[PDB]
């Protein structure tokens, strides 16, 4: 009786070879025993293949073939060194995958193909190449981060798959934070999109990651920005442009879907108070003038051309006062979102009361009242019918006051009638009056 089966034939042949001769090449031994194990574990083939099995309708066959060809190009281009032409090919292929429709329609196939793994492998190669030489081919990092952010936004399961790869992204979070126009194109943005609007992932967030982010933020307050001081921006001791990004990540970590994850908020508050350098020079406590004086100083910087600009493409001119103001607004927003919910305070949990007391000690009421009292500068029309427009990319923005209001509502609370009247008079009526004055069709 012959084997009559390929399985039995392999099982006989490999054993016969091994018992006939002592194989010297380790690769032959490995291959023979792998094949024998596959014959004796035939259910292994199914249990391994089925996870990577997908089904599509006939109408999407051509579109799937195009996506598979693009993925094959990107995969094959992992065996070649990073270069100009390879950069161009990565960019065209990733763009084709984005433009393709099955990428949106079938996220499960996209995840089963291991596409995010390939994109992040390209990113790892680019970032590793020249660690001491800073970053080369900076448009790979941008395009790959954008692709991964869209991949996260497609589906929740893809978001969890990207969350699995979190430690590396936070380790290289400082790739392109200082350079503008890269928003949504840095690994920190990928991490933020991976932990965005997911209670399960926010709760799965660990303490060491928050510690890493807090240390990066503390460094951004202790040390100036090397690239800005090299390009000629005036030197200040801290780095608002990166501090703002690191604060936005913590905002997304602590605040989710309208409520606040107390587990992730308490840790952030404790780390921030442990390292007071994260609060900026005004709030360090070592003779800091205060938030109200700091924002007035930033306004004066905004009018001053010398300190606002480098004074040796428009986005390259980082308006220094606006950067400081945005940093302070982001810090206040993060703290307000970390403030506990009022129902827990009603319940009387001691930890929430302690956190609220800490926040109130950190930020006095008067400073918030003053910052709310500060007003903008209205655009006006000349003779000619051309309304002059103060640069919105600079100057004081209503978004800055929005964070102040959020903190005031979430921490201090408006529960006293004369206090509400005083707040109204000092800061809310002037804003509404300015809005009403800006109601003309030309100014609208």
């Amino acid at each position: 009786k012959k084997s009559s089966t390929l399985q039995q034939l392999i099982s006989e042949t490999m054993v016969r070879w091994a018992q006939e001769s002592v194989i010297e090449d380790p690769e032959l031994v490995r291959a023979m025993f792998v094949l024998l194990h596959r014959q004796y574990d035939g259910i292994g083939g199914l249990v391994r293949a089925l996870p990577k099995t997908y089904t599509i309708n006939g109408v999407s066959v051509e579109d799937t073939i195009n996506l598979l060809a693009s993925l094959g190009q990107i995969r094959s281009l992992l065996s070649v060194r990073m270069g100009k032409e390879e950069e161009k090919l990565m960019i065209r292929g990733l763009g084709d995958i984005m433009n393709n429709k099955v990428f949106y329609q079938h996220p499960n196939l996209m995840r089963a193909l291991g596409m995010h793994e390939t994109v992040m492998e390209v990113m790892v190669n680019v970032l590793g190449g020249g660690e001491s030489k800073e970053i080369t081919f900076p448009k790979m990092v941008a395009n790959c981060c954008r692709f991964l952010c869209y991949f996260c936004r497609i589906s929740r399961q893809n978001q969890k798959a990207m969350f699995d790869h979190l430690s590396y992204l936070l380790e290289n979070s400082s790739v392109g934070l200082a350079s503008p126009a890269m928003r949504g194109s840095t690994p920190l943005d990928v991490a933020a999109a991976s932990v965005m609007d997911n209670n399960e992932l926010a709760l799965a967030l660990r303490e060491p990651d928050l510690e890493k982010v807090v240390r990066y933020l503390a460094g951004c307050g202790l040390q100036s920005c090397q690239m800005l001081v090299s390009k000629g921006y005036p030197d200040i001791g801290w780095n608002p442009v990166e501090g703002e990004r690191y604060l936005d990540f913590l905002r997304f970590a602590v605040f989710c879907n309208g409520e606040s994850v107390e587990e992730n908020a308490n840790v952030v508050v404790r780390l921030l108070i442990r390292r007071p350098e994260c609060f900026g020079p005004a709030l360090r406590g070592e003779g800091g003038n205060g938030l109200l004086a700091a924002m007035e100083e930033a306004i004066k910087i905004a009018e001053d051309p010398s300190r606002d600009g480098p004074s040796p493409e428009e986005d390259d001119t980082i308006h220094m006062g606006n950067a400081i103001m945005t940093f302070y607004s982001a810090l206040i927003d993060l703290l307000g979102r970390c403030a506990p919910e009022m129902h827990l305070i009603h319940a009387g949990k001691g930890e929430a009361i302690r956190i609220r007391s800490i926040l109130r000690s950190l930020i006095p009421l008067g400073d918030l009242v003053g910052v709310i009292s500060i007003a903008f500068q209205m655009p006006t029309i000349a003779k000619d019918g051309n309304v002059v427009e103060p640069d919105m990319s600079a100057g004081f923005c209503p978004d800055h006051k929005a964070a102040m209001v959020l903190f005031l509502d979430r921490v201090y609370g408006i529960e006293v009638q004369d206090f509400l009247l005083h707040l109204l008079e000092v800061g809310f009526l002037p804003d509404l009056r300015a809005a009403a004055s800006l109601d003309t069709a030309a100014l609208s």
């Binding site: 065996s79 070649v80 060194r81 270069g83 032409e85």
Partner: protein, 385 residues
Amino acid sequence: LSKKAKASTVDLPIESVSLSLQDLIGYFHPPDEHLEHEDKQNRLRALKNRQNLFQEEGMINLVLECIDRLHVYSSAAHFADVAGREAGESWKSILNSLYELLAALIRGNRKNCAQFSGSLDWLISRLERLEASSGILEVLHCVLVESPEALNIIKEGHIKSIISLLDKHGRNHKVLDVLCSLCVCHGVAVRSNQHLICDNLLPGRDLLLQTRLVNHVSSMRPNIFLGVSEGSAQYKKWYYELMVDHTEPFVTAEATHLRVGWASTEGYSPYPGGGEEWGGNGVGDDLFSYGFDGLHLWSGCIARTVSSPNQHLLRTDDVISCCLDLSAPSISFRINGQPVQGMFENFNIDGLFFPVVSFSAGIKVRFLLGGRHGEFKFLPPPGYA
């Protein structure tokens, strides 16, 4: 010695340096393959630790300094003029041993290969020198096989120098191995390096050996043997005809070969001279044969275009008439009764002559030799037999 202190005052421990270099080569010698696997692993760990300690103590820079100090002298004779005669003889051996030690120190250690990246450019600057070419090539191969960074330092000028090493030093497979290592390292291909190597080496077609398929060519000749000498009873003029019954232009990818004319023996031996026994050579491919293909006159493997009425490469139903005169060295042809406008003169008449046709596969021809053997379609020229 460079500062020109007198020779006997300066002391050069030549023998000590040679013996120490040999001992260090033995120290860094790689393990033998017949050793058992555990011994393999132990010796490999010991060699790796030795290399790491030497690199941390900076034993590689000292070797480079000695090498640089030794290359200031152009030749062994010059070094023997400056230093002593014994140093003169030992100078080549010491220089080779230093390069061997460098190769043994950097081989198999990725960290050392990476730290040698900065010094790569200085190393390849003396590749042209015959005194150190082999050692420099070995060191470069050892660096490139294991240092992915090194390929990022190797540039277009270095690739050109490596290629020109083949042109100036002749065929050497180690340069080819270095060029192969340049293309791909650790499964990753450097496309810029591939493009430069291709565009700088391949188009020349002057260094690498070339290959092509050549149709086999055979030769048909009659028994007659024609010669001229003083006091010899042989007529000086002869004439025969060839008829082409059928000829396929392209039986294979190459053009069909069909040449007719006269060939000359060497001396008085009955063997054709000056040509290979077998291959792609036929009538006119040497200086002992003279041929016609219908468009060109073939002699000495050189073809010159000759005009004729209605020029065409030999086709079906063509009558070729060949005329040989030995009174004055002269070979002339005539196609289909129309005389071709070219002829040979002043060729060697020492040897014997005979008709010959050379061909590849796909011909159908007949020898119209005259008389009982044939009938001439065109009546022979006057005085021609």
